[PDB]
Design a protein around this ligand. Structure first.
Ligand SMILES: *[C@@H]1O[C@H](CO)[C@@H](O)[C@H](O)[C@H]1NC(C)=O
Length: 379
């Protein structure tokens, strides 16, 4: 059964991150660490939703801080660099924030009710950048990660757009940009991404077409990186689809841009340029205007690896001990835990009293809940 490490009293789980194999659980007014089977606590200010623990011991923890976003170190001391804006939201709402090589990227508004953008903050990868108006959905993102596209680091983000007039439709995308992007070709555009492209994802089966992304992660294989994307639906089902990043990178490399029929500029939109090389005026104008590939990415096997119940909140993966390239996939709903074996294709489930926020695998599955940190599978 699950070994529960309980909070003194049930908490509002606001965020969960793994850093160097240590689990950081942000709540309202505190952050908890879990490792070596011990749950420890750093209390912080109250009315302070801890949305953010990132690497920049020296772990930066940030929260709404009663409506004035603020960051601390894990020991509760104030952050010497006075980070706040862009590191925690202005209220308890969903955020996407990541750091890679100490570079921080975030969709967190940097002013209250500001325009929703995906930003890189000033740092080791270059000065601050932001997406153009409406490039990112009002809803923000559902996933973000850094991955090499051959030679260069690119940032990939997932999100579901909402469009249409007579009919409101949802559209899932993955978008790519260069981690070290130097921005636009003129002073006015110099802090805008210059390499942003997006491509539609597909996750269909038997007429069911999944659109709302819940959560995602990647898995490295011998020759590829596999992107796992869990979708929800307003119906009674959810769905997990997988994608080849090689396939996705090829599409960004070779697809034409929707609505643009002239030969693409050179160098091409969306590729990374050596430090000191700036995007050309023509490429930037085209990419700003035509940021969507004329393509749609099909999942591996052309359908979901599996369908589950709607309302799945999170999932994670653990590669099977002796069956390599096989996995156990854990996923959760508010009050239930599920696992899918990729080899057998059997799904198991159990109901729990705990209100589950996420599942994160270290050497075992950790289930983070209102009641605390649960170690190991139940049933
Ligand atoms: C948690 O507390 C124990 C002492 O009870 C300590 O050994 C351990 O270092 C602490 N863990 C973290 C990550 O602070």
């Amino acid at each position: 059964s699950i070994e529960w490490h309980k909070f003194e009293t049930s908490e509002e789980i606001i965020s969960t991150y793994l850093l160097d194999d240590v689990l950081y659980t942000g709540v309202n007014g505190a952050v908890y660490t879990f490792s070596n089977n011990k749950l420890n606590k750093t209390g912080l200010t109250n009315n302070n939703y801890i949305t953010t623990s990132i690497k920049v011991k020296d772990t930066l923890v940030c929260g709404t801080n009663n409506g004035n976003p603020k960051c601390w170190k894990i020991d509760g001391s104030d952050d010497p660099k006075h980070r706040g804006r862009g590191y925690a939201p202005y209220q308890n709402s969903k955020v996407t924030i990541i750091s890679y090589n100490e570079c921080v990227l975030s969709d967190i508004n940097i002013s209250k009710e500001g325009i929703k953008r995906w930003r890189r903050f000033d740092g080791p990868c270059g000065y601050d950048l932001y997406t153009a108006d409406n490039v990112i959905p009002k809803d923000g993102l559902r996933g973000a990660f850094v991955d090499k596209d051959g030679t260069y680091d690119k940032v990939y983000i997932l999100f579901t757009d909402t469009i249409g007039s007579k009919r409101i439709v949802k559209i899932p995308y993955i978008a790519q940009m260069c981690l070290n992007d130097e921005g636009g070709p003129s002073s006015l555009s110099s802090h805008r991404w210059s390499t942003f492209l997006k491509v539609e994802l597909e996750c269909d089966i038997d007429g069911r077409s999944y659109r709302q992304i819940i959560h995602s992660r990647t898995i490295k294989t011998d020759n590829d990186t596999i992107l796992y994307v869990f979708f929800d639906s307003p119906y009674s089902k959810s769905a997990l689809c997988t994608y080849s990043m090689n396939t996705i990178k090829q599409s960004f490399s070779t697809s034409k841009l929707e609505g643009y029929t002239k030969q693409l500029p050179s160098p091409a939109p969306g590729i990374c340029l050596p430090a000191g090389k700036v995007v050309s005026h023509t490429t930037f104008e085209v990419i700003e205007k035509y940021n969507v590939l004329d393509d749609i990415i099909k999942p591996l096997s052309n359908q979901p690896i599996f369908e589950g119940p709607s309302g799945v909140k999170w999932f994670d993966i653990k590669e099977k001990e002796n069956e390599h390239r096989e996995y156990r996939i854990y996923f959760i709903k508010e009050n239930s835990i599920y696992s899918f074996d990729t080899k057998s294709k059997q799904t198991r489930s159990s109901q729990v009293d705990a209100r589950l926020f996420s599942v994160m695998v270290t050497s075992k599955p950790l289930f983070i809940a209102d009641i605390g940190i649960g170690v190991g599978m139940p049933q």
